[PDB]
Amino acid sequence: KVVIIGAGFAGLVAARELQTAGIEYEILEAKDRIGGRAWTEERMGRPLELGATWVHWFQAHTWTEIMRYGQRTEITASPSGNDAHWVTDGKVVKGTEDDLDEKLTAAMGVTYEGSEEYFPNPHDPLWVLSDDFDGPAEVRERFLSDDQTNAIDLVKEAGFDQETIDLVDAFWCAGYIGDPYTGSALMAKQWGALSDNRYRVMEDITLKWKLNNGMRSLYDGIAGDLNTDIRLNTPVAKVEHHDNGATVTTESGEVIEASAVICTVPVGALSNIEFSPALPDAVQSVIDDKWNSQGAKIWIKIKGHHRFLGYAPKPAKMSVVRSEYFMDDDTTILVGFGYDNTNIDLNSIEDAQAVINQWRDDLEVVDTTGHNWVADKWAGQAWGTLRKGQFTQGWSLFDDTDSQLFFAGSDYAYGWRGVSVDGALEKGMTTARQVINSMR
Ligand SMILES: Cc1cc2nc3c(=O)[nH]c(=O)nc-3n(C[C@H](O)[C@H](O)[C@H](O)COP(=O)(O)OP(=O)(O)OC[C@H]3O[C@@H](n4cnc5c(N)ncnc54)[C@H](O)[C@@H]3O)c2cc1C
Structure with a gap:
């Protein structure tokens, strides 16, 4: 009788949790596929x-699923030791990946400042504003002020x-997947807190280990455990909700009575x-303001085998680009993150060439692809x-x-919120547990 809207990771794991508790559920998914903003293709x-x-083993919920579905050893690190290039005052500077990481590490020290006072338990992000807060009043003042300051x-x-300003500009265009100047620096500080306040750990957690069998090995694994078929191609149009239950109406006009609704539809949709x-x-x-999530992710294929890393500040088409796969036909696939989904067509070879041309004139794009999540009616954002x-x-x-x-979804989590x-x-x-505890 519990209606779960959306068959992304939040909705799938909520369904499995309700199943464990013996609570009847139904998942309604708008698309013809499961996984949501995780999509291996x-x-x-x-x-x-x-x-x-x-993914990383310091992410408790992701790692448990990796273990559950047989993926413990099926992870591979992204390429490192790349030749690094960064745009600073309109010009390209070259160096090693270590050189770039050294500059970012120094900047991260100041960026994380306060995280040890704000987040002793990094899974209690709002402790400073709670009645249990016992620190000095100046810490609460700085905490509120930091919400109104961007990371740059x-x-x-x-x-x-x-040069360092331009590097952190590029870095946070990717990290905020959007204009970093409108963002809250407290997000970056909590990432630090969840990463032992070390840049290398933060990058190990968020930008290193890939799943050999894809996110699909995890989301298909969860769906494979469910004893109730997922209703694909069933967008929800209306939710009426009261203290005793709810009524859901689909796009087709079907009315479904529910004991509770777990809505995983992101703010952008x-x-x-x-x-x-x-x-x-x-x-x-x-909802009106959104999240700061207006950017985009591209995959670019170039001729030859090239160990490449590039950083460029706003308003570049792409702000962080890195080699990811060396293919058997003498090509390299690179990943890229940019602050503004509308300034680039992810499937235009000319725009992908323009991206590479931010740093080099001797690399040739032969293919490009991506899915513009911001322009996807069922997402309307990248990661929150x-x-x-x-x-x-x-x-x-x-x-x-x-x-x-x-409301359930990555964007409301206490821990690796939105990004993971x-x-x-x-x-x-935990939202399934809210429903379970209420029924019990
Ligand atoms: C470009 C990009 C890169 C990312 N990279 C990483 C990474 O490297 N590591 C990491 O850990 N995380 C990463 N993430 C984040 C991760 O994808 C998300 O945190 C997570 O997938 C969100 O899951 P969710 O269930 O909360 O939401 P969603 O996956 O958005 O699920 C919501 C579901 O609801 C459906 N839906 C929407 N509207 C309706 C409606 N009206 N009726 C019915 N169904 C509806 C949607 O189709 C979707 O299936 C990335 C995200 C993006 C966008």
Whole structure:
């Protein structure tokens, strides 16, 4: 009787949790596929992750699923020791990957500042604003101020030179997958807290280990455990929600009565659903503003075998580009992240060549691909990232729902929020527990 909207990782893991508890459920998915913003598909001659790629054993929820579904040894590190190139004052500088990582590491020290005072338990991000907070008032003041400051201004104010500013600009265009200047620095500080406050750990967690058999090995694994068939091609159009239950109406007009609704539709796509009663004003403000998630991910194929890393600041088409696969026909597939989905066509060879031309004039693009999640009606965003003010008055507001409508998804997680499948698996599971505990 529990209706789960969406067959991404949050909805799939919530269904499995309800199944463990003996609670009847149904998953309604708009697309003709499961996985959501995780999507492994053959393109350009090999399986490519069009969304979600990297994992780590320090991500508890993701790692448990890797172990459950047989993928313990089926991980491979992305290429390292690349020849690095970065754009700073309109010019290309060359160096080793170590040289670049050394500059980023120094900048991260200032970027993380305060994380040890804010996040002693990095899974209690709002402890500073709780009644259990016992530190000095200046820590709470700085915490609130940091929600209104972007991560680049922290580096500027610390006196780093233009080269380092341009490097962190590029870095956070990728990390905020959007304009980093509108973002909340508290997001970066919590990533530090979850990464033992070390840049190398943060990159090991978010940008190193890939699944040989893809995210699909995990999402197909969860779906394979479910005893109730997923209803594909069944978009939800309306959710009526009250203290005792809910009523869901699909696009086709079908009415489904529910004891509770677990809604995993991300903010970028919530406007497709009519909520009755209307969602609270503070939650609607977040939906209207969005998340800071307007960027895009590309896969580019070039001739030859090239160990390449490139960084470029806003407003570049792509801000971080790295070699990922060396193919058997003397080509290299590279991944790229850019701040602005509308400034690049992910499937245009000319735009992909323009990306590579940001750093070199001697590399030739032969193929390119990607899926523009921001222009996907059922997503409307890449991974969720925080605008100024959204660390303290954003993601946590979706819990302030008195009715039997529950919001679950990576974007509302306490831990690796938005950026990681770990957050979807966390919040899908704990939202199922909210439903279970209420019924018990
Ligand atoms: C480009 C990109 C790269 C990423 N890389 C990584 C990475 O390297 N590592 C990592 O850990 N994470 C990564 N992620 C993040 C990861 O993909 C997400 O955190 C996670 O997949 C989100 O899961 P979810 O279940 O919360 O939401 P979703 O996956 O968005 O699931 C929501 C589901 O609801 C469906 N839906 C939407 N509207 C409706 C409707 N009206 N009715 C019915 N169904 C509907 C959608 O089709 C979708 O299937 C990346 C994300 C992106 C966008």
